[PDB]
mmCIF file of C-alpha atoms in Angstrom:
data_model
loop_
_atom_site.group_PDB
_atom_site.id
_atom_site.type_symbol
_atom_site.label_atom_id
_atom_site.label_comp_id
_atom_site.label_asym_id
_atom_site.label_seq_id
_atom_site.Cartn_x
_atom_site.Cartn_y
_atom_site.Cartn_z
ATOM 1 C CA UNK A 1 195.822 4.191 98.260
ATOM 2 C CA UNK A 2 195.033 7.722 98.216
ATOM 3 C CA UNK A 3 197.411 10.599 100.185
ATOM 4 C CA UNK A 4 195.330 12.366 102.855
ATOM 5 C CA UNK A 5 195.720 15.899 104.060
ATOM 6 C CA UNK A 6 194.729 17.996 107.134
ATOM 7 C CA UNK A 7 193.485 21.606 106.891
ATOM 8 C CA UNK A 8 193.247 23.050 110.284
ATOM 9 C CA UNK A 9 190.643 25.908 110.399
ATOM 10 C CA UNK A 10 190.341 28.467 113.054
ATOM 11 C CA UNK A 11 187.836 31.442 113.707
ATOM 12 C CA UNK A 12 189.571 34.102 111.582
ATOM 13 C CA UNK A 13 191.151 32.221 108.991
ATOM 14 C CA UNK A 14 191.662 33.642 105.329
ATOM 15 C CA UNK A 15 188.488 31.991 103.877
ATOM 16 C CA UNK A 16 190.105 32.198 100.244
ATOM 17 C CA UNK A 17 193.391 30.852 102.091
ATOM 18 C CA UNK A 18 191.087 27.520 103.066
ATOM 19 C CA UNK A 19 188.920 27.057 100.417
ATOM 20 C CA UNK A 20 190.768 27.311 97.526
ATOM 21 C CA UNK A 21 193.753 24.743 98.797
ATOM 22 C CA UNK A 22 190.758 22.779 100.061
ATOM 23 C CA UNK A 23 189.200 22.502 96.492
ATOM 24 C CA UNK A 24 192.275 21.951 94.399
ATOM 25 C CA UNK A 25 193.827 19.449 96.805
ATOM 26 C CA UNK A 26 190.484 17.315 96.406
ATOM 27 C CA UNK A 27 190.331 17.768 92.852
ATOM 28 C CA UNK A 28 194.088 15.755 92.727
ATOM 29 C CA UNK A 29 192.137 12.954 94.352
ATOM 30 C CA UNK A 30 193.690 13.244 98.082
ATOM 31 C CA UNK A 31 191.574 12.967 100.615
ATOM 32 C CA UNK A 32 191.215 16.411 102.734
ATOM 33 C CA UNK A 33 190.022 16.852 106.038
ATOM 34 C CA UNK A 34 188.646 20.335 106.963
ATOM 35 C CA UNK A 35 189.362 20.512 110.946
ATOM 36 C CA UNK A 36 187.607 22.994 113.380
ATOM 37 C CA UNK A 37 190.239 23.975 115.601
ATOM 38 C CA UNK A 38 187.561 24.812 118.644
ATOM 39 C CA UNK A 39 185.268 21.835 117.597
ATOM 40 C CA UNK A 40 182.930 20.559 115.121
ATOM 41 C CA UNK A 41 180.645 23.771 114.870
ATOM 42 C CA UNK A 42 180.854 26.010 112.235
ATOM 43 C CA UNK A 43 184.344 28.508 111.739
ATOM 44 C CA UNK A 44 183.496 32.337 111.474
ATOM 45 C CA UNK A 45 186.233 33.427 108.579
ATOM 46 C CA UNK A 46 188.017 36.373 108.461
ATOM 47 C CA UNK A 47 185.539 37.954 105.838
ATOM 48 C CA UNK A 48 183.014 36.126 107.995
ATOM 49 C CA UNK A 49 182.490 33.317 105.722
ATOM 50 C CA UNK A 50 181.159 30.591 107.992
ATOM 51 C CA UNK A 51 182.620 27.169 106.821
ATOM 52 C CA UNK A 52 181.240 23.784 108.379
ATOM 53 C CA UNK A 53 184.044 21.285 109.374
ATOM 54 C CA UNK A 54 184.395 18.045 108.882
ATOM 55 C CA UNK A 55 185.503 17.030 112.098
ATOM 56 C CA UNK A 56 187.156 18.412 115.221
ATOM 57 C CA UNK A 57 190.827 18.365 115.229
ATOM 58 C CA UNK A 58 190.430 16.136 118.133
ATOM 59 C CA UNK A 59 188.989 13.644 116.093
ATOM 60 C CA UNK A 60 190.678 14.601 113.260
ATOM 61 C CA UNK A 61 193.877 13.747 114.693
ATOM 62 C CA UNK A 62 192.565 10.387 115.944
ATOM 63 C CA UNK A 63 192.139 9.471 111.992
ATOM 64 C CA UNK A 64 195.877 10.148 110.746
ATOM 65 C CA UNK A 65 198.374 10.687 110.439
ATOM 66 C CA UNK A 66 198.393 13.139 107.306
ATOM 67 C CA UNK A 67 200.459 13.281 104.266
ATOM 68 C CA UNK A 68 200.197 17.229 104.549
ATOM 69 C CA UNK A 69 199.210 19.336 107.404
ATOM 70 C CA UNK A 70 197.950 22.892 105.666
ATOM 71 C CA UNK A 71 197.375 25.963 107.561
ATOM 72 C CA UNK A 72 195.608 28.934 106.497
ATOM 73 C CA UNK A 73 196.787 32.069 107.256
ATOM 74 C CA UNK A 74 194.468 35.142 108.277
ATOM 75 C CA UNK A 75 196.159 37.002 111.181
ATOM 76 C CA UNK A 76 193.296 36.162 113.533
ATOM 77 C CA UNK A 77 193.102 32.239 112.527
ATOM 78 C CA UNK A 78 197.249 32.238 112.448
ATOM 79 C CA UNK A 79 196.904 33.811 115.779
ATOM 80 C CA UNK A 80 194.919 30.871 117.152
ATOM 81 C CA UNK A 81 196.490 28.117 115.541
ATOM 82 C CA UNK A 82 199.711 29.935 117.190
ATOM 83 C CA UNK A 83 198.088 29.553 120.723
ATOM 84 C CA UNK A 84 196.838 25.925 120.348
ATOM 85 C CA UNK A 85 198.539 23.136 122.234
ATOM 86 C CA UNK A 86 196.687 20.637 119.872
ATOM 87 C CA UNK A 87 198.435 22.611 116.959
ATOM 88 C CA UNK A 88 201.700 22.582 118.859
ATOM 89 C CA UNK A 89 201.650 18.701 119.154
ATOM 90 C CA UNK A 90 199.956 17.564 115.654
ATOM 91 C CA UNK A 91 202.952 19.775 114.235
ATOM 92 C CA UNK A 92 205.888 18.541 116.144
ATOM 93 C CA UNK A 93 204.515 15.009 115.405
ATOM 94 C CA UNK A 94 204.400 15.194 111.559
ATOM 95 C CA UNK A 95 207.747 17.202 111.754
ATOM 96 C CA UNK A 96 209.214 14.242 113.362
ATOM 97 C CA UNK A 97 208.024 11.446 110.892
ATOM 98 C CA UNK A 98 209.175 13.634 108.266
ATOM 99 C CA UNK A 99 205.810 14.265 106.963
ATOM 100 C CA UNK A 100 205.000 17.849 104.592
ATOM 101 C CA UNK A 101 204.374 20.927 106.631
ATOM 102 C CA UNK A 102 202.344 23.408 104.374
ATOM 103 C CA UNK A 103 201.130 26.802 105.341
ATOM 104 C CA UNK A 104 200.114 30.356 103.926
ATOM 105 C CA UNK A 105 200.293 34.075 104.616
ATOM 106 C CA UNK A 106 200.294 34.455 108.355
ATOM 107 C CA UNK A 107 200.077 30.814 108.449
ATOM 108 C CA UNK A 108 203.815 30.249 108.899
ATOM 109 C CA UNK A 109 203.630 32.585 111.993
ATOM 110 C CA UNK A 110 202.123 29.662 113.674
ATOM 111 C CA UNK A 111 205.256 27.515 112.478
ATOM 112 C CA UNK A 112 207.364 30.279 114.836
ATOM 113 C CA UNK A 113 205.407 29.772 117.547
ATOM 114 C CA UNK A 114 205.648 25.910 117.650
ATOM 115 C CA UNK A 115 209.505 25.839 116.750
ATOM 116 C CA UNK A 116 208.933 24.267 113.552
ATOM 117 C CA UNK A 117 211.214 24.067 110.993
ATOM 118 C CA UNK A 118 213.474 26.466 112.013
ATOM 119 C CA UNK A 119 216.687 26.991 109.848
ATOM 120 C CA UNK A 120 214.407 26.721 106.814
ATOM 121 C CA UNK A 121 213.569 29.123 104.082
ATOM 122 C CA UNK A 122 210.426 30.619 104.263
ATOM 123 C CA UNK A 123 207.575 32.662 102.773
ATOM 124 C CA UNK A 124 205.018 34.629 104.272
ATOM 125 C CA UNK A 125 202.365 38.049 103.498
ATOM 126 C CA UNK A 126 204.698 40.838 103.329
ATOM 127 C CA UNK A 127 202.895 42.125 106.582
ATOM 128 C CA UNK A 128 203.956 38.971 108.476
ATOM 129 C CA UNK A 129 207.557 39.037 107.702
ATOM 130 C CA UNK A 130 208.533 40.944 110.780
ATOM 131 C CA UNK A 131 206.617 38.290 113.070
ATOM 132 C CA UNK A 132 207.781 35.364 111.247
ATOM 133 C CA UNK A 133 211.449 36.658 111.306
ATOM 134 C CA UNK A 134 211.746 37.501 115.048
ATOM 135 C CA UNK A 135 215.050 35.987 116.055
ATOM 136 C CA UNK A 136 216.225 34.764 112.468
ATOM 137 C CA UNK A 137 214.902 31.576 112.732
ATOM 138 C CA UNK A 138 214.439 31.425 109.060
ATOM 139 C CA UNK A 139 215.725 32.523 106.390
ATOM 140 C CA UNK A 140 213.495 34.941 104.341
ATOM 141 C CA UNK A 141 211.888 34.744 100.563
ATOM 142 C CA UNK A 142 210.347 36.488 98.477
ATOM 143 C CA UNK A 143 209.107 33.811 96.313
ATOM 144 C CA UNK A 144 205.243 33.083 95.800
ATOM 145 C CA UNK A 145 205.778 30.168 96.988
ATOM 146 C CA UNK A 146 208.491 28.564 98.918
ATOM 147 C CA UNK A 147 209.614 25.199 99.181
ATOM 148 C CA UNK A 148 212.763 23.744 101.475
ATOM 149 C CA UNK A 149 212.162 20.089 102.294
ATOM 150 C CA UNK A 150 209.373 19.485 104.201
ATOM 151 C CA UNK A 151 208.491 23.158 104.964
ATOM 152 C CA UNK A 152 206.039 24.426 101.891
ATOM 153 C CA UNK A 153 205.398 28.032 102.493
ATOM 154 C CA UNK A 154 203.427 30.780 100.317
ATOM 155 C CA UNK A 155 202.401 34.718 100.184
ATOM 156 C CA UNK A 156 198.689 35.385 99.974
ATOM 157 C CA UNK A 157 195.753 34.804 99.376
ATOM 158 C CA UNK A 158 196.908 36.009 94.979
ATOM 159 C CA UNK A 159 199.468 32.777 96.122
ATOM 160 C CA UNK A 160 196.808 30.570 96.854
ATOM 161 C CA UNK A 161 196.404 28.476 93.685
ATOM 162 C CA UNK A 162 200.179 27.825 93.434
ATOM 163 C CA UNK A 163 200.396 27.133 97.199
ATOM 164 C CA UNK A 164 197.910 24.522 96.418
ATOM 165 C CA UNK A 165 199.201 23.236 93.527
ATOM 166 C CA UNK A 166 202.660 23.055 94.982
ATOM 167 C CA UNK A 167 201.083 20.694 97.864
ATOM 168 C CA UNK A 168 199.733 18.466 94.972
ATOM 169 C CA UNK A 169 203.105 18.491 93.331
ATOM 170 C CA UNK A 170 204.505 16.879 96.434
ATOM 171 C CA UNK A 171 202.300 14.435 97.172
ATOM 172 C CA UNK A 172 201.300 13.455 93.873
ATOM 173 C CA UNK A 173 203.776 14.298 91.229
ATOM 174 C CA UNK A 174 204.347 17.060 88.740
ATOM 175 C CA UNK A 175 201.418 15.416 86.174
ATOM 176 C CA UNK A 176 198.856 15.365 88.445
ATOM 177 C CA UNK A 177 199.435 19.028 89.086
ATOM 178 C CA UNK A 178 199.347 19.907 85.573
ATOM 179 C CA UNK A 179 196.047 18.186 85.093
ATOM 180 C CA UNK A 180 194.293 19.682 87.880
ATOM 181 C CA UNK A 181 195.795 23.210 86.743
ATOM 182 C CA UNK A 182 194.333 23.164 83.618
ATOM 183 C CA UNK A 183 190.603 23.385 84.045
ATOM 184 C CA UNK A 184 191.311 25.899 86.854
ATOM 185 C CA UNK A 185 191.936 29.149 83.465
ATOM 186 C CA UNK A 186 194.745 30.440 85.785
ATOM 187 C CA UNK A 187 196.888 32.579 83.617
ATOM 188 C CA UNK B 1 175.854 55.099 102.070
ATOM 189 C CA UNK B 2 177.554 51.379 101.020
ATOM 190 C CA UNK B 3 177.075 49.649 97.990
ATOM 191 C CA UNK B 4 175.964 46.267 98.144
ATOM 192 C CA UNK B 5 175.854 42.588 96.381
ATOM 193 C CA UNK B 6 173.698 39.648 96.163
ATOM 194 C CA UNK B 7 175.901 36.746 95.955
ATOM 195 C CA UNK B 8 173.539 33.649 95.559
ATOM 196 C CA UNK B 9 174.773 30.295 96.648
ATOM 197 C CA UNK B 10 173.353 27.035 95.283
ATOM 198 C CA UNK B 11 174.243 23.258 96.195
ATOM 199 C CA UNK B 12 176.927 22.032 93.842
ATOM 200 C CA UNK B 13 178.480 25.441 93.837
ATOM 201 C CA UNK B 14 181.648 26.282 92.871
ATOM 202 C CA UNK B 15 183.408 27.309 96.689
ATOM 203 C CA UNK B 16 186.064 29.145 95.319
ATOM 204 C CA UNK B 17 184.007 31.003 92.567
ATOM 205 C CA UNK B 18 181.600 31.727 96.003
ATOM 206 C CA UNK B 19 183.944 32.422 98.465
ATOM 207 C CA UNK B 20 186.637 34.911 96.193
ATOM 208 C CA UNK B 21 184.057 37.486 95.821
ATOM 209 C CA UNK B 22 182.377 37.399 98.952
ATOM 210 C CA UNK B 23 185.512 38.190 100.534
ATOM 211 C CA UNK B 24 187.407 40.591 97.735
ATOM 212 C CA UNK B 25 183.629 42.290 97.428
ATOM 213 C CA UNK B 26 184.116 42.864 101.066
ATOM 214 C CA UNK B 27 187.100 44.288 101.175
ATOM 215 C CA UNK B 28 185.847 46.945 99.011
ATOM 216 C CA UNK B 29 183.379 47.608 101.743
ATOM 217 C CA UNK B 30 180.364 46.598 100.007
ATOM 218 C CA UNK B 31 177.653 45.069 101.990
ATOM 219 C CA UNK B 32 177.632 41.106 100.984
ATOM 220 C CA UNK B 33 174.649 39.091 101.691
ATOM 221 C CA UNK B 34 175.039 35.063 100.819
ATOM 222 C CA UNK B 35 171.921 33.749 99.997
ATOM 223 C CA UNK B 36 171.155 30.481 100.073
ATOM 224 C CA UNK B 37 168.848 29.275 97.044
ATOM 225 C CA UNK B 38 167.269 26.206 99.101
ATOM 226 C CA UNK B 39 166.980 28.288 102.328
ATOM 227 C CA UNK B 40 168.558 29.048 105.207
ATOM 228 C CA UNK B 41 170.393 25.877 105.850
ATOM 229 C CA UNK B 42 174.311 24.990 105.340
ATOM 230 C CA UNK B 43 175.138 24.481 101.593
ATOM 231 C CA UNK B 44 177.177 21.655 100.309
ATOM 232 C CA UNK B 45 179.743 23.045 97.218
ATOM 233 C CA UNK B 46 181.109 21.164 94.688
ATOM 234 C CA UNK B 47 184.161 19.782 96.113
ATOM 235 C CA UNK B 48 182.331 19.589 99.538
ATOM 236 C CA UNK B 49 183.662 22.486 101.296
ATOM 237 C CA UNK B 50 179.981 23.782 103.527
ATOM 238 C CA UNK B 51 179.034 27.076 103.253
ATOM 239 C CA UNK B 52 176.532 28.884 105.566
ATOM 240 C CA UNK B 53 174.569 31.086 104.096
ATOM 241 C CA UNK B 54 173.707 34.359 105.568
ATOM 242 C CA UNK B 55 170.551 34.276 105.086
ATOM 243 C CA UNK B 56 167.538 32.217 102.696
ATOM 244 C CA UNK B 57 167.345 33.763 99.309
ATOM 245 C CA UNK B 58 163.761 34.658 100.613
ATOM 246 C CA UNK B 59 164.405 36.904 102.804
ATOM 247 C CA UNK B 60 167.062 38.011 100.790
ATOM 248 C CA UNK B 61 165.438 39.319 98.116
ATOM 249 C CA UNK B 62 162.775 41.590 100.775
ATOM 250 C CA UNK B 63 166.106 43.443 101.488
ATOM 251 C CA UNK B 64 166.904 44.044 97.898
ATOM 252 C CA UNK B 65 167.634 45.993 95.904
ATOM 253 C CA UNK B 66 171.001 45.347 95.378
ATOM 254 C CA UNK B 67 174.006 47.073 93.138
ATOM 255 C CA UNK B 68 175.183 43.730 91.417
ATOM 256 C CA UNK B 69 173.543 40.027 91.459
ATOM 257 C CA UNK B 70 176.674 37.705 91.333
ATOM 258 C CA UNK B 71 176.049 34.159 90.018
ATOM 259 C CA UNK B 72 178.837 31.625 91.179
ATOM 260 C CA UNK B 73 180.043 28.707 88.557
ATOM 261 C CA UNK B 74 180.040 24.773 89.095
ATOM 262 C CA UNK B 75 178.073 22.969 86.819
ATOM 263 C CA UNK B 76 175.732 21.217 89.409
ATOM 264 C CA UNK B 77 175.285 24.798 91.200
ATOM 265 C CA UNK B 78 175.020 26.971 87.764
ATOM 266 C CA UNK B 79 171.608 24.379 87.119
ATOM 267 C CA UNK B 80 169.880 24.963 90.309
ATOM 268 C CA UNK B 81 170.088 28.598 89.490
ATOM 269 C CA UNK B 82 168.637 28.007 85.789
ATOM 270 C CA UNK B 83 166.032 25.850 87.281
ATOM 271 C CA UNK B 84 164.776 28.599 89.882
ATOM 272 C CA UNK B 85 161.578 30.569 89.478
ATOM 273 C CA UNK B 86 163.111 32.656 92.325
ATOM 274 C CA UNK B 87 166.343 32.983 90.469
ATOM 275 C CA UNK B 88 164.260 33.886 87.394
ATOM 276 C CA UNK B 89 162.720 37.232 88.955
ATOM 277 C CA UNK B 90 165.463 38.629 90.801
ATOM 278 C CA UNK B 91 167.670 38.960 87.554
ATOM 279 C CA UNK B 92 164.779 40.181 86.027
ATOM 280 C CA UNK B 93 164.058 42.692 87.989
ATOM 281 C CA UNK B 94 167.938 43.457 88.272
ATOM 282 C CA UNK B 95 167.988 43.783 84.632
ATOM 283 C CA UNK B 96 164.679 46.021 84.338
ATOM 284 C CA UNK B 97 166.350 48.496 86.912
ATOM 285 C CA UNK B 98 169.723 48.410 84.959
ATOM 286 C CA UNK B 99 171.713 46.872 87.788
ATOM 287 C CA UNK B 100 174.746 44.981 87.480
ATOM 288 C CA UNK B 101 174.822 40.963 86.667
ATOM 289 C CA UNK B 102 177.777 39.211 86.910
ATOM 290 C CA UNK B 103 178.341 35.391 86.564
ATOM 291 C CA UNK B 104 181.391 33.013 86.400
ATOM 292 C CA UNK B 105 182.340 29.755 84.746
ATOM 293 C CA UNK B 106 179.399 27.899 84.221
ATOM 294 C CA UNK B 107 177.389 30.850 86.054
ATOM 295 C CA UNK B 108 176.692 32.840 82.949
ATOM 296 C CA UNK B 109 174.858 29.455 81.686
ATOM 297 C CA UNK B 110 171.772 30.828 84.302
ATOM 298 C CA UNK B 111 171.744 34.308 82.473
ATOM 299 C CA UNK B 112 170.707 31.826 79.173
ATOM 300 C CA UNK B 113 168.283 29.702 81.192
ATOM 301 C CA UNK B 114 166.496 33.149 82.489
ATOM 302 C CA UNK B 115 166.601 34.789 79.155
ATOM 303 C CA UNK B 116 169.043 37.420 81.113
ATOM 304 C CA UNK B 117 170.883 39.951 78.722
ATOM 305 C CA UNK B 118 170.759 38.780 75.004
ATOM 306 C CA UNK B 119 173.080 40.152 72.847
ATOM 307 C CA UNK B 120 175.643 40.595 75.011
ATOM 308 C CA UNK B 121 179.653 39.681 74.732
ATOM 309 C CA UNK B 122 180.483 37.104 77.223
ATOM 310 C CA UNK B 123 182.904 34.503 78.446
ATOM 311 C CA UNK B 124 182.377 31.123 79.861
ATOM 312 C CA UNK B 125 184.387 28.203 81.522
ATOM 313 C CA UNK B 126 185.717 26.736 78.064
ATOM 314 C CA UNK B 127 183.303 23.242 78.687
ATOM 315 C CA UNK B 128 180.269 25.679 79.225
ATOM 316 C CA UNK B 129 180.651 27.743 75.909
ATOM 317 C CA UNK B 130 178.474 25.159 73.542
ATOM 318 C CA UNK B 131 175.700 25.667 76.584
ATOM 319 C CA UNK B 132 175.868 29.010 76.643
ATOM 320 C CA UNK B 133 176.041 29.455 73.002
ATOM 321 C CA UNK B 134 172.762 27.664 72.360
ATOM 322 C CA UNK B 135 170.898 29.325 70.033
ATOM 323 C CA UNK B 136 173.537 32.305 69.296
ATOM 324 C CA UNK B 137 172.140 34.392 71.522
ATOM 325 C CA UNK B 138 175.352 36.038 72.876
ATOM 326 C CA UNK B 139 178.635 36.720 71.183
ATOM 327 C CA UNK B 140 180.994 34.699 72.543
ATOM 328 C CA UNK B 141 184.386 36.093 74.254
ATOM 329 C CA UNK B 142 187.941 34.332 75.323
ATOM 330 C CA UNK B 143 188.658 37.667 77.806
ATOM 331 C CA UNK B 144 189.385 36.060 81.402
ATOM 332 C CA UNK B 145 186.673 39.010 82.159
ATOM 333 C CA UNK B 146 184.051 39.942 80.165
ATOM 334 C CA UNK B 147 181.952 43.178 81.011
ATOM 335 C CA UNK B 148 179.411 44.443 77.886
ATOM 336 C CA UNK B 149 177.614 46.909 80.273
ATOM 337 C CA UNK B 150 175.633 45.490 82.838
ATOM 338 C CA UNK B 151 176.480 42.061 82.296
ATOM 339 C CA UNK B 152 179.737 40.855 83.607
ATOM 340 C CA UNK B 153 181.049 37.515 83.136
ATOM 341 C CA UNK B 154 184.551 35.447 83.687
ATOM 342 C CA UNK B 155 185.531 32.381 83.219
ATOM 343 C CA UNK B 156 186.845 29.767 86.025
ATOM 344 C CA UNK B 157 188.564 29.722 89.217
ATOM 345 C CA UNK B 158 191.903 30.834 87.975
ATOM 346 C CA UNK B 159 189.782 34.048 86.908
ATOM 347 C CA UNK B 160 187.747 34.734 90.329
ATOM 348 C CA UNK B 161 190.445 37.319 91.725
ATOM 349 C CA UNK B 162 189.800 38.934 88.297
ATOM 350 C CA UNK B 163 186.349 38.231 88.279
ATOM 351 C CA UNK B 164 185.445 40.178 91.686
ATOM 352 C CA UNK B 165 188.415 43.015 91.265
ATOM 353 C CA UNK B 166 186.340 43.903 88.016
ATOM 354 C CA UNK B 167 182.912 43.765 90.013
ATOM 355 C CA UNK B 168 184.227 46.036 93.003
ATOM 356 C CA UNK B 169 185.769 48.851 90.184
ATOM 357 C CA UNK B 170 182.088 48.552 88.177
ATOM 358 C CA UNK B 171 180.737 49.310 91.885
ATOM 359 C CA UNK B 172 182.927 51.623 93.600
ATOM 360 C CA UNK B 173 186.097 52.601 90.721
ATOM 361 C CA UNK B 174 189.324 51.627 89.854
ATOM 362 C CA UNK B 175 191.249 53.204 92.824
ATOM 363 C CA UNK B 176 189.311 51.345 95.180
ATOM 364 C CA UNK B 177 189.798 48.100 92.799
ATOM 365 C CA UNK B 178 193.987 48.850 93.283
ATOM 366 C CA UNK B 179 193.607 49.592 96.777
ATOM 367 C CA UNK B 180 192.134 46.455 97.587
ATOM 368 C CA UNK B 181 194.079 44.223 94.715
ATOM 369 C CA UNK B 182 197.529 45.296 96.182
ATOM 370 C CA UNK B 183 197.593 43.052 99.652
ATOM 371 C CA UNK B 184 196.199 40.421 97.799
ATOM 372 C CA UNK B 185 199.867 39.219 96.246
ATOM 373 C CA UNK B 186 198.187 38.596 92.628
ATOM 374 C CA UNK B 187 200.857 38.373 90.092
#
């Protein structure tokens, strides 16, 4: 039985911040599903990139739940995943079965927003920090990426791989995450 | 006056080796333009992520010329661009007028294909060297980048960051390549 994640992708996401977790996290065999926040139609990027999802959330969230719920950063898409009531609940939800909360860059902004995981250690862009730390509702790393229970942070979209890699370690095992590293000629 | 890149996108592409330079390129300001080989339609990668192209490589090309050609990697994607009569004439032309070339992974595999810059150093994805090397018609390289004048090559995913950083400072110089590296978070 494979492990299944859920990528949640708004208009302005990090393109590089989606794609690449998307990529490696199917190359460890789980199953990912690329949610449109708005819908089903295609996601203008940050870099305007236009990705087709696989689904709407709505329907996405019909199909779990998810091993992993990943979320791309991108100030724009972090800003709308930040504002979504979909986001808020699929979130608390996985928080509260004690399922893996993953997210990148500005992407743990949206973890603020929704009260998530507060009291954990946390990672985000160095331009984010300020957001992500307003009230001290975390405690602050500089790591490239940062792991404290179910709360999986990283940096950038220079973060990416091990951000992915570090999802695939979780789910998956160290191994698998070594084998799926190696074709990738990361340094 | 802008600088701008070709970046053609062919089914069974490599996403990440696609979507890293189209966004680092365009951070450098240059003008990107995703072409899709097949036409205008969405473009199913390698690991299924769907791309839309900005436009059909046919129309494309009436807009030309451009400062660099980039050539994505993924096996599946690197022999729809050998196969291409289309593919064929715009890197000839590009290498007539002593424009840039630059290919990753398996990507450099369509520079053999085309008969595209013989005698050039170059790198490969490690499991597209013997391809490549058919014939001995390049001198093979182990650099994560690759650059032997106009032809610019790289070798996997792990390298893309690399890959496009080296494209942008062949296009617009190595202060521009810093400015741009440094909110990425690369190690």
């Amino acid at each position: 039985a494979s492990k299944r994640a859920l990528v949640i992708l708004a208009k302005g996401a990090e393109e590089m911040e989606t794609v690449i977790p998307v990529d490696v996290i199917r190359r460890a065999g789980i199953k990912v599903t690329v949610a449109g926040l708005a819908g089903k139609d295609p996601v203008q990027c940050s870099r305007d990139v236009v990705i087709c999802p696989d689904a709407s959330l709505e329907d996405a969230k019909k199909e779990g739940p998810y091993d992993v719920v990943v979320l791309p950063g991108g100030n724009l898409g972090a800003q709308n995943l930040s504002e979504s009531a979909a986001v808020k609940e699929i979130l608390k939800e996985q928080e509260n079965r004690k399922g893996l909360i993953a997210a990148i860059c500005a992407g743990p902004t949206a973890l603020l927003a929704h009260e998530i995981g507060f009291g954990s250690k946390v990672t985000t862009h160095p331009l984010a920090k300020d957001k992500m730390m307003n009230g001290g509702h975390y405690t602050y790393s500089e790591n490239r990426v940062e792991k404290d229970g179910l709360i999986l942070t990283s940096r950038g979209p220079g973060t990416s791989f091990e951000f992915a890699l570090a999802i695939v370690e979780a789910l998956n095992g160290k191994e698998v995450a070594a084998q799926v590293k190696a074709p990738l000629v990361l340094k």
